[model samples]
Target: MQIFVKTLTGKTITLEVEPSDTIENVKAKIQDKEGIPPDQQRLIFAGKQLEDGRTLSDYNIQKESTLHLVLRLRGG
Candidate 1:
């Protein structure tokens, strides 16, 4: 399945993975593609935070579904 991750700044990232992949798995892909660490990445779909242990299927994520990636904001 394909996921379109939209960032707060209007950046979109294309990702490919299986339905069995966990949220953490998605975050790892983001780390490789965007240089953002998993712990610092927050995945949101339909306004719900995607949990690390849960699979994408658990959230009913479909192909071409758009998810939001919110990075952890600390001292700036």
Candidate 2:
């Protein structure tokens, strides 16, 4: 299925992920595509943390669904 990922910068990216793809997997893919490290990626779905081992299906995300991935930077 195709999922729409929106970056913190307001850029929209589309990715084709399998039904079995976990939220972590998608995060990794997004990191690769956006050049953001895994530790810096923070994805929130329905006001909850989108962590590893949780699939899109777990969040009721389907094809053409849009997910917000916010990149967080730390330190001064």
Candidate 3:
């Protein structure tokens, strides 16, 4: 299945991942593409924080689902 991931920087990336892929897998993929750390990664769907081990199936994510991954950063 293919999923659309939107970043906080206003960038969008489409990934073709397996249906069995967990939210953590999505986070790792986003971090790999955006150069962000997994610890600081936040993914919100339908205004709820996806639990770590939750799979796409658990959230009712479809083949063309669009998910938003916001990366939080701190600056001096």
Candidate 4:
């Protein structure tokens, strides 16, 4: 399935994902495409923070669904 990831700057990235992919897997894809580390990424779907342990199917996420990505604080 295909989903959209919206960045803070209104840049929408299209990603190919499987319903069985975990939130962590999605984060890894964002890392590859956007250069953001998985640990520093936060994904929000339907106004809820997505858990790394949960799959898209677990959340009943459908194809073409959009997820918001927020950058986590990176401390020195």
Candidate 5:
């Protein structure tokens, strides 16, 4: 399945992922393509936070879905 990954840079990239893929898996891909570490990524879709332990399908995410990649905050 294919999906759209939106970055803070105002760019959107297409990603091919499986229903079996976890959110962490997607994060890994983002880390590779966008230079953002998996642990430093906060994945959100439909206004909900995606948990690393859950599979993509668990969120009812489908093809053409849009995922926003927010950077995790550091020193507060």
Candidate 6:
């Protein structure tokens, strides 16, 4: 399956992932693609938080699902 991940800046990237893939694993892929590390990635979908211990399917994520991505604003 594929997912549409959108950044806060309006940038969007699609990823091919399995339904069984954990949100953390997906974050890893995003880290490789967008330079946002897993620990810092704040993911939202359907206006709810996507948990790390949950699978993509756990959140009912599917093809073309839009995942809002935000970088955790940590101390500079």
Per-candidate clashes, comma-separated: 0, 0, 0, 0, 0, 0
How much lDDT does each candidate structure score?
Answer: 0.89, 0.78, 0.80, 0.87, 0.85, 0.87
Please give the range of 10 consecutive residues that has the lowest summed lDDT in model 2: 67-76
**Model 2 lDDT tens row, 1-75:** 888877667889788898788877887888778777777877766677688888788888888888877777732
RMSD of 3: 2.8
Q: Model 4, 11-40: lDDT tens per residue?
A: 799899999999988999988998989988
Write candidate 3's Cα lDDT for 1-76 as tens digits: 8889886678888878888899888888877777777888777777777888889888888888888877556321
Worst 10 residues of 1 by lDDT: 67-76
Candidate 4 stretches with Cα past 4 Å from truth are 74-76
Best by lDDT: 1
Residues 1-76 of candidate 6 have per-residue lDDT tens digits of 8799998788898888998999989999998888888988889999997887999989998877889888787322
Evaluate residue 75 in candidate 1 and report its C-alpha lDDT on the 0 to 100 scale: 19
**How much does candidate 2 score in TM-score?**
0.82
| Candidate 3 clashes between residue pairs 3 or more apart in a chain or in different chains | none
In candidate 5, the residue pairs with backbone N, CA or C atoms under 3 Å apart (3 or more residues apart, or in different chains) clash, namely: none
Model 6 lDDT on a 0 to 1 scale: 0.87
Cα TM-score per model: 0.92, 0.82, 0.83, 0.90, 0.88, 0.91
Q: For residue 33, what is the lDDT in candidate 6? A: 89
lDDT of 4: 0.87
Of 1 and 6, the candidate ranking higher by lDDT: 1
Instruction: Answer with 2 or 3, whichever has the higher lDDT.
Output: 3
Write the number of the candidate with greater TM-score, choosing between 1 and 5: 1
